[PDB]
Amino acid sequence: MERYENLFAQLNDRREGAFVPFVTLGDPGIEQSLKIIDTLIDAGADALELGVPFSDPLADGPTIQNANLRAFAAGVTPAQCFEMLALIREKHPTIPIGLLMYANLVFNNGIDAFYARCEQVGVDSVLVADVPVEESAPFRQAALRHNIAPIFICPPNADDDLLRQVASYGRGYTYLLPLHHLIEKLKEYHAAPALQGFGISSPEQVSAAVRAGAAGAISGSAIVKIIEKNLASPKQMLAELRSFVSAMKAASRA
Amino acid sequence: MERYENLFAQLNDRREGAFVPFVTLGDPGIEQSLKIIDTLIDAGADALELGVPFSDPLADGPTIQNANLRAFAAGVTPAQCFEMLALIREKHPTIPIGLLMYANLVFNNGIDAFYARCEQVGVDSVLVADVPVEESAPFRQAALRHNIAPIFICPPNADDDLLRQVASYGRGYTYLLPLHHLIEKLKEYHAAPALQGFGISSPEQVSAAVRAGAAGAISGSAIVKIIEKNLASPKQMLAELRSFVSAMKAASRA
Amino acid sequence: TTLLNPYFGEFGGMYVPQILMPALNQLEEAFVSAQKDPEFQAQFADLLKNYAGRPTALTKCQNITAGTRTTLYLKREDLLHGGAHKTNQVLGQALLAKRMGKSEIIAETGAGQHGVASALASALLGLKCRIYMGAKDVERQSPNVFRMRLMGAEVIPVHSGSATLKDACNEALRDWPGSYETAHYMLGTAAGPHPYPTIVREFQRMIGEETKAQILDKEGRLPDAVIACVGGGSNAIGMFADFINDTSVGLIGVEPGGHGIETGEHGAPLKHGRVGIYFGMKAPMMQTADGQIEESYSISAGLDFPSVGPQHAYLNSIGRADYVSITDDEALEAFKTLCRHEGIIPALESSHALAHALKMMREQPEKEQLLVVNLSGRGDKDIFTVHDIL
Amino acid sequence: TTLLNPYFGEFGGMYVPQILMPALNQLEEAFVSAQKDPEFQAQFADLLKNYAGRPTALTKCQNITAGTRTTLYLKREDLLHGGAHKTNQVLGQALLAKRMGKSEIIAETGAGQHGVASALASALLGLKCRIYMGAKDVERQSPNVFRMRLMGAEVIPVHSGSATLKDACNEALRDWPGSYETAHYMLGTAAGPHPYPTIVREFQRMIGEETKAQILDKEGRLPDAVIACVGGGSNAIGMFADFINDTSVGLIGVEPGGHGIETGEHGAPLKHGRVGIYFGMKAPMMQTADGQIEESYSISAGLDFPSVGPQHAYLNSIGRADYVSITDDEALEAFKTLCRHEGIIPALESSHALAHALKMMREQPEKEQLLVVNLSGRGDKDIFTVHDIL
Ligand SMILES: *Cc1c(COP(=O)(O)O)cnc(C)c1O
Ligand SMILES: *Cc1c(COP(=O)(O)O)cnc(C)c1O
Ligand code: NA
Ligand code: NA
């Protein structure tokens, strides 16, 4: 959690939004994914949201489903992913790193065990895609005992009881899926700062998210379509991911 | 009918049984069948029992069913059969000629019409294979108005009421399917003289039929197996039918 | 001599070789005796209820009829065990064969549903069943041939004549004279020599008895018309019998019109053939001009019997039932309408009955009319024929 | 917040993305309301009686059991409309979707019988039905795919992950968050997120209620054990529910043992897998050692769901039901025994239940025991699989 509090304080000293790309760990292979992620960071990502491949991603669309397919075609497992993470962290001490997990992968060998392994490699938050606030107690509690921020989605028609639980229960940031109203409620309830997610796919939505009052934006699958499109030239794939991230981050600046 | 009364009177002056072969009209073609029949007669047949090909011969076995198949492969129809018969008769004025008919072929165009056509070409009797005595009235009556003998099968377990109707209703001969008892009953009821049928396939059964007291024997399908076997040499087929008939008839002699 | 009358006006009779008369007289004796025997009546009722699953529903089809003043019910013999109504009268004839002390069953089959019926009844009741099936039909009915064998029956292919249903009916009639002391001939429609047209009507008449009590219950009055397809006539005479003395009720039988009557490739001998004598009886037949019997054509394999029961020919001749025809594409249309508007896949035999009801509604859509169609079986078995055509 | 409890001891729950919670809460609300509504109860009863053909028979199998002191009845959900018990709970969930004002149905299917069910109910009740089916399963289930299309449904192939049933269940859960204002998710077993395990039990519980009244009638006492196959758990929990509080009655569920447990190619996660969280619920799953979900193997395509309902896992953990397995060749043996000795072709899913009853009789043939097997569907659809193996 610490690392996101530091980040948002730094961004706010600059009057600047955060830009957070998503990618799947190991897509399209481990060594290639290590270089895409060092590229996102060098081009200006403020934090990363990283996916572990899971056989049945019932809350993802086609782009992501095909990311997991490429990762499993390369042999990628959760174990390999935790190795990956420890390297990313050793190379980059301050950038916040979140995971996007399916429940089974966290409950597998023991939910406390999972949060202790994220706390050992240096993950800062975990969003579990199929656990709603109503079922989240063991997840939040275990994240919190291991200094990991549990992140929750605040869906678009969130009624007021849901607002208040997402504010009470989340830490790090609120994954926000009329906007100006969702956002002002979350601040009223003292929620973690809000990142707009979904459809963030060009510079102007970054800018508009910050201007609605969100702390930043998350690009849930546009980084992934750039890999998918450039599979035949690793070098060209890096370049186009540098170009895209550079401009999204340009847009968060004041 | 006259011609069978004359025949049995002649046979009885000689203390001799009758031998009556069956064949299908047009098997295996019209001109070939005309020559098999002139052969049966020249070799000593005392009367003929002739089949008209019918699509569903539900009271015949395999040998006969295959005879009708060959006849239909040659185009044979009931009309052609009546032409055939008129030629046989013109060539041979005294031999009795019976038909073995299915009901539909007699009822087709009018049962009186059928018996008048047999009376015009010179048939002397008709056995209809699927009409039992219980349904025979229109058949017998029409046979009788046209001087044609209606023939009935006296089956092997014929109870006494059936004996008496078969004796009352048949003329020409009784088609007989303990023997010495069936036969003595038929004579008691003054039935038409009895021909043993079924399985008459070698000389010794001719002789034994006459010795049980029957007037003769009918070879229901052995003549047909000799055609079936010799289809590839018409000349050899005639010879073997002459040999077989000559010996069956030898056996009826006293 | 008989105990009951073998004829329906001019149609019917016992036209079999003399050596089979004792089998028929014995069977008529046994049946009259069973119909007076309440222990037999209870035995039959109980297999039909706890084995076959009677009574079967009467379903109102409101989506089909919307926008017209037709109300249509379907009597659901497609929910009977085995999928068609032929199971009711095989359980009755099996129990009659046990009553006569027999241990063996003979049966004939065309598309194979009577063979399947007769094999299930023999399996349940401890009889050894052999089935004659013309060889062209065995080649085209694998699923049916293997169900009969799964159920223990001997399936004997018949290669003579046309190698279809009339040819196996001839082969059954050849076997039975040598075996009738221990085997029963389980004939599979309301046709053939007496006493079969009577027996099979009486062992199917509960379709019509349940229809009457179910319609009275649900609408308070009898149907305007009850409509059934006619291959040899058993499901139709089983729906009609209880309504014959209710003279306001229309009885309508529908023969297969195939490619069209005027093409000559159909199966409608009652209205389009000519009376002849074959299979044991005098009745309208599919036959050539000089008297040879021919086959009936339909897209529905089950409407293949090339004559019709003699009670149908009698009720047409006195005008108490009317008979019509429906062609292959009329049947196919009604089978698709029923699947998509009611969720019911009907047999393409039954589809012929539903087609004619759908024309009675669509030609005069404001005529108030209460119709029952006998849905004689289900149509799982037709879905690929209906696949490949379309 | 919920109105009813989502868990059965530790199993169950609502593990879905947050944006789907309003769909589940709305559906639980509607269902509680319908279960108190006698006009709903009459509407359901009437389609089950006059459309689906309830009640279904309970048949005594005396040939099977001869020579032993086992009496075995079979509850005949194979005579229900569509051929399997899955038709009872789709007519109930369709009526619940109409209660909520919805006009569209989503459903998932493996071997295709739930797709066929859900397409017939949507056709009869005026809903527009789309069905997800993994692409490997569409390729191997043509007859089912075409019945769904004959009946009007849209069939959408799913090519992601393993392109089988778990993959279409994922695709249904992807669609529903964008469409729940007008579409109902008609889940096809007693599993998945709350309230589905409850709803589907309550819409199948008439199998067990009719079994109790029918056994009391015919034998005067309840069964020693009632036996049902367990793919995801709906036909089994529908036979067990009315008997749970009758503590003398054994409840036995039988999972597919495939090639043999010890081969690892089976479908028995309740006794042989490991609790995980997937599809909405915490329950035993077929899964790898690091948590990826895998497929269940059986010769029977319908026992393919790779988890089990959470009420089964709860009733095993407290010992009120027992669970066992039966392998492919045990099932195939019982399917042949039933065809040849009783004239009944059972589904190879049901065959698993009958196999285990046949072993309870044959290992201890002088133990007096009154057994009911739920014969959850018919087996026309298996005759060529059972053809080609043998
Ligand atoms: C055989 C069959 C028919 C035709 O025979 P009938 O004797 O005329 O009833 C009709 N419907 C089905 C489902 C059949 O199997
Ligand atoms: C689908 C099916 C089953 C398996 O599903 P459950 O939910 O376990 O009942 C069993 N029998 C038949 C006939 C089926 O179609
Ligand atoms: Na006909
Ligand atoms: Na399972």
PDB file of N, CA, C and O in Angstrom, chain B residues 53-60 65 72 77-78 103-105 107-108 129-130 132-135 139 153 155 157 162, chain C residues 7 13-18 21 160 166-167 170 173-174 180 274-279 282 287 289-293:
ATOM      1  N   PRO B  53     -47.300 -65.519 -62.151  1.00  0.00           N
ATOM      2  CA  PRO B  53     -46.457 -64.670 -61.247  1.00  0.00           C
ATOM      3  C   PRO B  53     -47.227 -63.591 -60.586  1.00  0.00           C
ATOM      4  O   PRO B  53     -47.960 -62.911 -61.258  1.00  0.00           O
ATOM      5  N   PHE B  54     -46.973 -63.456 -59.242  1.00  0.00           N
ATOM      6  CA  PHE B  54     -47.836 -62.476 -58.522  1.00  0.00           C
ATOM      7  C   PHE B  54     -46.637 -61.871 -57.573  1.00  0.00           C
ATOM      8  O   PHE B  54     -45.772 -62.586 -57.137  1.00  0.00           O
ATOM      9  N   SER B  55     -46.794 -60.644 -57.333  1.00  0.00           N
ATOM     10  CA  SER B  55     -45.691 -59.702 -56.613  1.00  0.00           C
ATOM     11  C   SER B  55     -45.529 -60.272 -55.187  1.00  0.00           C
ATOM     12  O   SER B  55     -44.322 -60.176 -54.741  1.00  0.00           O
ATOM     13  N   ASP B  56     -46.590 -60.823 -54.568  1.00  0.00           N
ATOM     14  CA  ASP B  56     -46.419 -61.160 -53.055  1.00  0.00           C
ATOM     15  C   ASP B  56     -46.923 -62.556 -52.689  1.00  0.00           C
ATOM     16  O   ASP B  56     -47.977 -62.679 -52.128  1.00  0.00           O
ATOM     17  N   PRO B  57     -46.151 -63.582 -53.063  1.00  0.00           N
ATOM     18  CA  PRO B  57     -46.663 -64.950 -52.894  1.00  0.00           C
ATOM     19  C   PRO B  57     -46.533 -65.520 -51.523  1.00  0.00           C
ATOM     20  O   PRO B  57     -45.720 -66.360 -51.249  1.00  0.00           O
ATOM     21  N   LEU B  58     -47.456 -64.976 -50.590  1.00  0.00           N
ATOM     22  CA  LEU B  58     -47.307 -65.172 -49.108  1.00  0.00           C
ATOM     23  C   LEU B  58     -47.662 -66.566 -48.764  1.00  0.00           C
ATOM     24  O   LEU B  58     -47.651 -66.860 -47.503  1.00  0.00           O
ATOM     25  N   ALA B  59     -47.968 -67.473 -49.708  1.00  0.00           N
ATOM     26  CA  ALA B  59     -48.085 -68.902 -49.254  1.00  0.00           C
ATOM     27  C   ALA B  59     -47.014 -69.809 -49.928  1.00  0.00           C
ATOM     28  O   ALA B  59     -47.066 -71.044 -49.711  1.00  0.00           O
ATOM     29  N   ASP B  60     -46.095 -69.229 -50.694  1.00  0.00           N
ATOM     30  CA  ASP B  60     -44.921 -69.935 -51.231  1.00  0.00           C
ATOM     31  C   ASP B  60     -43.541 -69.835 -50.578  1.00  0.00           C
ATOM     32  O   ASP B  60     -43.034 -68.750 -50.122  1.00  0.00           O
ATOM     33  N   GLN B  65     -40.658 -68.449 -54.876  1.00  0.00           N
ATOM     34  CA  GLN B  65     -40.555 -67.003 -54.862  1.00  0.00           C
ATOM     35  C   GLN B  65     -39.557 -66.588 -55.877  1.00  0.00           C
ATOM     36  O   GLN B  65     -39.680 -65.550 -56.544  1.00  0.00           O
ATOM     37  N   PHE B  72     -40.779 -62.305 -63.638  1.00  0.00           N
ATOM     38  CA  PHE B  72     -41.007 -60.831 -63.713  1.00  0.00           C
ATOM     39  C   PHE B  72     -39.736 -60.260 -64.373  1.00  0.00           C
ATOM     40  O   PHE B  72     -39.859 -59.298 -65.059  1.00  0.00           O
ATOM     41  N   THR B  77     -46.688 -61.078 -67.581  1.00  0.00           N
ATOM     42  CA  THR B  77     -47.866 -60.576 -66.972  1.00  0.00           C
ATOM     43  C   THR B  77     -49.006 -61.634 -67.038  1.00  0.00           C
ATOM     44  O   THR B  77     -48.905 -62.542 -67.793  1.00  0.00           O
ATOM     45  N   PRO B  78     -50.113 -61.412 -66.304  1.00  0.00           N
ATOM     46  CA  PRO B  78     -51.272 -62.324 -66.356  1.00  0.00           C
ATOM     47  C   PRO B  78     -51.784 -62.393 -67.766  1.00  0.00           C
ATOM     48  O   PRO B  78     -52.084 -63.505 -68.191  1.00  0.00           O
ATOM     49  N   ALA B 103     -55.457 -64.585 -54.666  1.00  0.00           N
ATOM     50  CA  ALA B 103     -56.757 -63.913 -54.835  1.00  0.00           C
ATOM     51  C   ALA B 103     -56.834 -62.626 -55.550  1.00  0.00           C
ATOM     52  O   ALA B 103     -57.815 -62.356 -56.277  1.00  0.00           O
ATOM     53  N   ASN B 104     -55.855 -61.762 -55.262  1.00  0.00           N
ATOM     54  CA  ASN B 104     -55.997 -60.505 -55.964  1.00  0.00           C
ATOM     55  C   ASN B 104     -56.133 -60.495 -57.579  1.00  0.00           C
ATOM     56  O   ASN B 104     -56.692 -59.654 -58.180  1.00  0.00           O
ATOM     57  N   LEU B 105     -55.416 -61.469 -58.136  1.00  0.00           N
ATOM     58  CA  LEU B 105     -55.342 -61.673 -59.547  1.00  0.00           C
ATOM     59  C   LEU B 105     -56.659 -62.220 -60.057  1.00  0.00           C
ATOM     60  O   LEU B 105     -57.090 -61.916 -61.274  1.00  0.00           O
ATOM     61  N   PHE B 107     -59.636 -61.535 -58.356  1.00  0.00           N
ATOM     62  CA  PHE B 107     -60.683 -60.540 -57.968  1.00  0.00           C
ATOM     63  C   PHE B 107     -60.535 -59.179 -58.805  1.00  0.00           C
ATOM     64  O   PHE B 107     -61.620 -58.499 -58.980  1.00  0.00           O
ATOM     65  N   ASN B 108     -59.337 -58.890 -59.261  1.00  0.00           N
ATOM     66  CA  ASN B 108     -58.852 -57.747 -60.115  1.00  0.00           C
ATOM     67  C   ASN B 108     -59.805 -57.066 -60.927  1.00  0.00           C
ATOM     68  O   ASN B 108     -60.318 -55.980 -60.532  1.00  0.00           O
ATOM     69  N   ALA B 129     -54.719 -69.546 -53.556  1.00  0.00           N
ATOM     70  CA  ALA B 129     -53.827 -70.006 -52.450  1.00  0.00           C
ATOM     71  C   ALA B 129     -54.243 -69.363 -51.052  1.00  0.00           C
ATOM     72  O   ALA B 129     -54.062 -70.013 -50.005  1.00  0.00           O
ATOM     73  N   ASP B 130     -54.868 -68.212 -51.163  1.00  0.00           N
ATOM     74  CA  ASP B 130     -55.175 -67.421 -49.902  1.00  0.00           C
ATOM     75  C   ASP B 130     -56.638 -67.225 -49.816  1.00  0.00           C
ATOM     76  O   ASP B 130     -57.131 -66.257 -49.247  1.00  0.00           O
ATOM     77  N   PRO B 132     -59.477 -69.368 -48.069  1.00  0.00           N
ATOM     78  CA  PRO B 132     -59.912 -70.577 -47.317  1.00  0.00           C
ATOM     79  C   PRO B 132     -61.333 -70.937 -47.568  1.00  0.00           C
ATOM     80  O   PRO B 132     -62.086 -70.067 -48.143  1.00  0.00           O
ATOM     81  N   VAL B 133     -61.771 -72.119 -47.204  1.00  0.00           N
ATOM     82  CA  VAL B 133     -63.174 -72.460 -47.477  1.00  0.00           C
ATOM     83  C   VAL B 133     -64.162 -71.473 -46.915  1.00  0.00           C
ATOM     84  O   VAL B 133     -65.151 -71.195 -47.590  1.00  0.00           O
ATOM     85  N   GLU B 134     -63.825 -70.885 -45.742  1.00  0.00           N
ATOM     86  CA  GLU B 134     -64.733 -69.882 -45.152  1.00  0.00           C
ATOM     87  C   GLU B 134     -64.944 -68.692 -46.025  1.00  0.00           C
ATOM     88  O   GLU B 134     -66.001 -68.013 -45.832  1.00  0.00           O
ATOM     89  N   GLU B 135     -63.983 -68.346 -46.928  1.00  0.00           N
ATOM     90  CA  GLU B 135     -64.231 -67.189 -47.757  1.00  0.00           C
ATOM     91  C   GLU B 135     -64.473 -67.537 -49.166  1.00  0.00           C
ATOM     92  O   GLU B 135     -64.493 -66.670 -50.094  1.00  0.00           O
ATOM     93  N   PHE B 139     -65.938 -67.455 -55.171  1.00  0.00           N
ATOM     94  CA  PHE B 139     -64.925 -68.093 -56.021  1.00  0.00           C
ATOM     95  C   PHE B 139     -65.538 -69.458 -56.608  1.00  0.00           C
ATOM     96  O   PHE B 139     -65.526 -69.703 -57.821  1.00  0.00           O
ATOM     97  N   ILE B 153     -57.249 -76.964 -50.578  1.00  0.00           N
ATOM     98  CA  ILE B 153     -56.238 -77.747 -49.787  1.00  0.00           C
ATOM     99  C   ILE B 153     -56.906 -78.297 -48.578  1.00  0.00           C
ATOM    100  O   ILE B 153     -57.620 -77.615 -47.842  1.00  0.00           O
ATOM    101  N   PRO B 155     -55.697 -79.577 -45.262  1.00  0.00           N
ATOM    102  CA  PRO B 155     -54.510 -79.418 -44.537  1.00  0.00           C
ATOM    103  C   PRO B 155     -54.396 -80.760 -43.565  1.00  0.00           C
ATOM    104  O   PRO B 155     -55.353 -81.509 -43.381  1.00  0.00           O
ATOM    105  N   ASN B 157     -53.991 -81.599 -40.312  1.00  0.00           N
ATOM    106  CA  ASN B 157     -54.766 -81.725 -39.069  1.00  0.00           C
ATOM    107  C   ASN B 157     -56.268 -81.331 -39.337  1.00  0.00           C
ATOM    108  O   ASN B 157     -57.066 -80.983 -38.444  1.00  0.00           O
ATOM    109  N   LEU B 162     -63.975 -79.491 -41.363  1.00  0.00           N
ATOM    110  CA  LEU B 162     -63.232 -79.009 -42.541  1.00  0.00           C
ATOM    111  C   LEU B 162     -63.243 -80.104 -43.597  1.00  0.00           C
ATOM    112  O   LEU B 162     -63.424 -79.849 -44.812  1.00  0.00           O
TER     113      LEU B 162
ATOM    114  N   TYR C   7     -66.025 -58.619 -40.917  1.00  0.00           N
ATOM    115  CA  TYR C   7     -66.124 -57.608 -42.031  1.00  0.00           C
ATOM    116  C   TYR C   7     -66.700 -56.275 -41.501  1.00  0.00           C
ATOM    117  O   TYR C   7     -67.401 -56.227 -40.375  1.00  0.00           O
ATOM    118  N   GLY C  13     -62.327 -59.456 -43.747  1.00  0.00           N
ATOM    119  CA  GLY C  13     -62.366 -60.906 -44.094  1.00  0.00           C
ATOM    120  C   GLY C  13     -61.047 -61.552 -43.436  1.00  0.00           C
ATOM    121  O   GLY C  13     -60.314 -60.942 -42.669  1.00  0.00           O
ATOM    122  N   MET C  14     -60.920 -62.836 -43.908  1.00  0.00           N
ATOM    123  CA  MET C  14     -59.868 -63.772 -43.527  1.00  0.00           C
ATOM    124  C   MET C  14     -59.259 -64.399 -44.741  1.00  0.00           C
ATOM    125  O   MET C  14     -59.455 -65.609 -44.852  1.00  0.00           O
ATOM    126  N   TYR C  15     -58.551 -63.657 -45.594  1.00  0.00           N
ATOM    127  CA  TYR C  15     -58.017 -64.242 -46.810  1.00  0.00           C
ATOM    128  C   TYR C  15     -56.636 -64.758 -46.653  1.00  0.00           C
ATOM    129  O   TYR C  15     -55.626 -64.213 -47.084  1.00  0.00           O
ATOM    130  N   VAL C  16     -56.617 -65.856 -45.896  1.00  0.00           N
ATOM    131  CA  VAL C  16     -55.280 -66.438 -45.681  1.00  0.00           C
ATOM    132  C   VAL C  16     -55.238 -67.921 -46.149  1.00  0.00           C
ATOM    133  O   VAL C  16     -56.298 -68.582 -46.284  1.00  0.00           O
ATOM    134  N   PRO C  17     -54.048 -68.532 -46.360  1.00  0.00           N
ATOM    135  CA  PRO C  17     -54.150 -69.976 -46.680  1.00  0.00           C
ATOM    136  C   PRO C  17     -54.880 -70.825 -45.648  1.00  0.00           C
ATOM    137  O   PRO C  17     -54.906 -70.474 -44.474  1.00  0.00           O
ATOM    138  N   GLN C  18     -55.495 -71.949 -46.011  1.00  0.00           N
ATOM    139  CA  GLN C  18     -56.334 -72.675 -44.995  1.00  0.00           C
ATOM    140  C   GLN C  18     -55.523 -73.032 -43.796  1.00  0.00           C
ATOM    141  O   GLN C  18     -56.073 -73.123 -42.676  1.00  0.00           O
ATOM    142  N   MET C  21     -55.963 -70.774 -40.742  1.00  0.00           N
ATOM    143  CA  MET C  21     -57.228 -70.447 -40.090  1.00  0.00           C
ATOM    144  C   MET C  21     -57.248 -70.833 -38.665  1.00  0.00           C
ATOM    145  O   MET C  21     -57.779 -70.130 -37.713  1.00  0.00           O
ATOM    146  N   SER C 160     -36.639 -61.004 -50.694  1.00  0.00           N
ATOM    147  CA  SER C 160     -37.528 -61.242 -51.698  1.00  0.00           C
ATOM    148  C   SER C 160     -38.405 -60.008 -52.094  1.00  0.00           C
ATOM    149  O   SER C 160     -38.547 -59.120 -51.312  1.00  0.00           O
ATOM    150  N   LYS C 166     -43.983 -54.766 -47.386  1.00  0.00           N
ATOM    151  CA  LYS C 166     -44.966 -55.849 -47.829  1.00  0.00           C
ATOM    152  C   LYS C 166     -44.307 -57.124 -47.922  1.00  0.00           C
ATOM    153  O   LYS C 166     -44.934 -58.183 -47.587  1.00  0.00           O
ATOM    154  N   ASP C 167     -43.014 -57.094 -48.284  1.00  0.00           N
ATOM    155  CA  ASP C 167     -42.272 -58.352 -48.289  1.00  0.00           C
ATOM    156  C   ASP C 167     -42.019 -58.893 -46.990  1.00  0.00           C
ATOM    157  O   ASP C 167     -42.099 -60.175 -46.839  1.00  0.00           O
ATOM    158  N   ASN C 170     -45.014 -60.644 -45.841  1.00  0.00           N
ATOM    159  CA  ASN C 170     -45.342 -62.005 -46.531  1.00  0.00           C
ATOM    160  C   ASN C 170     -44.594 -63.064 -45.763  1.00  0.00           C
ATOM    161  O   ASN C 170     -45.116 -64.187 -45.456  1.00  0.00           O
ATOM    162  N   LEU C 173     -46.149 -64.173 -42.644  1.00  0.00           N
ATOM    163  CA  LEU C 173     -47.289 -65.071 -42.896  1.00  0.00           C
ATOM    164  C   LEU C 173     -46.813 -66.468 -43.351  1.00  0.00           C
ATOM    165  O   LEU C 173     -47.552 -67.494 -43.202  1.00  0.00           O
ATOM    166  N   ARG C 174     -45.603 -66.539 -43.834  1.00  0.00           N
ATOM    167  CA  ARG C 174     -44.961 -67.847 -44.112  1.00  0.00           C
ATOM    168  C   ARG C 174     -44.482 -68.581 -42.944  1.00  0.00           C
ATOM    169  O   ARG C 174     -44.541 -69.845 -42.911  1.00  0.00           O
ATOM    170  N   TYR C 180     -47.327 -71.671 -35.013  1.00  0.00           N
ATOM    171  CA  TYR C 180     -48.341 -70.973 -34.254  1.00  0.00           C
ATOM    172  C   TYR C 180     -48.623 -71.667 -32.859  1.00  0.00           C
ATOM    173  O   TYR C 180     -49.176 -70.999 -31.989  1.00  0.00           O
ATOM    174  N   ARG C 274     -57.354 -48.798 -55.262  1.00  0.00           N
ATOM    175  CA  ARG C 274     -58.428 -49.640 -55.748  1.00  0.00           C
ATOM    176  C   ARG C 274     -58.584 -50.900 -54.869  1.00  0.00           C
ATOM    177  O   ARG C 274     -57.516 -51.387 -54.459  1.00  0.00           O
ATOM    178  N   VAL C 275     -59.819 -51.237 -54.553  1.00  0.00           N
ATOM    179  CA  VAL C 275     -60.002 -52.446 -53.645  1.00  0.00           C
ATOM    180  C   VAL C 275     -59.403 -53.683 -54.300  1.00  0.00           C
ATOM    181  O   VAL C 275     -59.505 -53.940 -55.478  1.00  0.00           O
ATOM    182  N   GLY C 276     -58.636 -54.365 -53.422  1.00  0.00           N
ATOM    183  CA  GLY C 276     -58.116 -55.632 -53.807  1.00  0.00           C
ATOM    184  C   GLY C 276     -58.109 -56.631 -52.597  1.00  0.00           C
ATOM    185  O   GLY C 276     -58.669 -56.261 -51.541  1.00  0.00           O
ATOM    186  N   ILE C 277     -57.459 -57.811 -52.754  1.00  0.00           N
ATOM    187  CA  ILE C 277     -57.408 -58.751 -51.629  1.00  0.00           C
ATOM    188  C   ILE C 277     -55.976 -59.060 -51.540  1.00  0.00           C
ATOM    189  O   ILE C 277     -55.260 -59.642 -52.421  1.00  0.00           O
ATOM    190  N   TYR C 278     -55.331 -58.681 -50.389  1.00  0.00           N
ATOM    191  CA  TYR C 278     -53.980 -59.049 -50.167  1.00  0.00           C
ATOM    192  C   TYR C 278     -53.716 -58.907 -48.589  1.00  0.00           C
ATOM    193  O   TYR C 278     -54.496 -58.263 -47.867  1.00  0.00           O
ATOM    194  N   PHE C 279     -52.638 -59.485 -48.095  1.00  0.00           N
ATOM    195  CA  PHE C 279     -52.440 -59.515 -46.639  1.00  0.00           C
ATOM    196  C   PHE C 279     -53.572 -59.952 -45.921  1.00  0.00           C
ATOM    197  O   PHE C 279     -53.792 -59.430 -44.834  1.00  0.00           O
ATOM    198  N   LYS C 282     -59.685 -57.772 -47.618  1.00  0.00           N
ATOM    199  CA  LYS C 282     -60.219 -57.025 -48.916  1.00  0.00           C
ATOM    200  C   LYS C 282     -60.257 -55.582 -48.378  1.00  0.00           C
ATOM    201  O   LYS C 282     -60.994 -55.222 -47.504  1.00  0.00           O
ATOM    202  N   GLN C 287     -51.776 -50.755 -55.974  1.00  0.00           N
ATOM    203  CA  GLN C 287     -51.585 -51.878 -56.983  1.00  0.00           C
ATOM    204  C   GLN C 287     -51.567 -51.468 -58.487  1.00  0.00           C
ATOM    205  O   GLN C 287     -52.206 -50.438 -58.912  1.00  0.00           O
ATOM    206  N   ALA C 289     -52.336 -51.865 -62.629  1.00  0.00           N
ATOM    207  CA  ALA C 289     -53.642 -52.015 -63.325  1.00  0.00           C
ATOM    208  C   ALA C 289     -54.067 -53.602 -63.483  1.00  0.00           C
ATOM    209  O   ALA C 289     -55.267 -53.953 -63.502  1.00  0.00           O
ATOM    210  N   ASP C 290     -53.012 -54.413 -63.547  1.00  0.00           N
ATOM    211  CA  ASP C 290     -53.328 -55.902 -63.662  1.00  0.00           C
ATOM    212  C   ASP C 290     -53.217 -56.587 -62.273  1.00  0.00           C
ATOM    213  O   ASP C 290     -53.275 -57.767 -62.218  1.00  0.00           O
ATOM    214  N   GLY C 291     -53.091 -55.833 -61.136  1.00  0.00           N
ATOM    215  CA  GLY C 291     -53.363 -56.529 -59.890  1.00  0.00           C
ATOM    216  C   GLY C 291     -52.067 -56.823 -59.127  1.00  0.00           C
ATOM    217  O   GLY C 291     -52.091 -57.585 -58.130  1.00  0.00           O
ATOM    218  N   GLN C 292     -50.809 -56.295 -59.452  1.00  0.00           N
ATOM    219  CA  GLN C 292     -49.681 -56.618 -58.677  1.00  0.00           C
ATOM    220  C   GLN C 292     -49.578 -55.523 -57.526  1.00  0.00           C
ATOM    221  O   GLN C 292     -49.942 -54.419 -57.847  1.00  0.00           O
ATOM    222  N   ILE C 293     -49.112 -55.935 -56.342  1.00  0.00           N
ATOM    223  CA  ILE C 293     -49.214 -54.902 -55.238  1.00  0.00           C
ATOM    224  C   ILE C 293     -47.877 -54.068 -55.373  1.00  0.00           C
ATOM    225  O   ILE C 293     -46.619 -54.495 -55.710  1.00  0.00           O
TER     226      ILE C 293
END
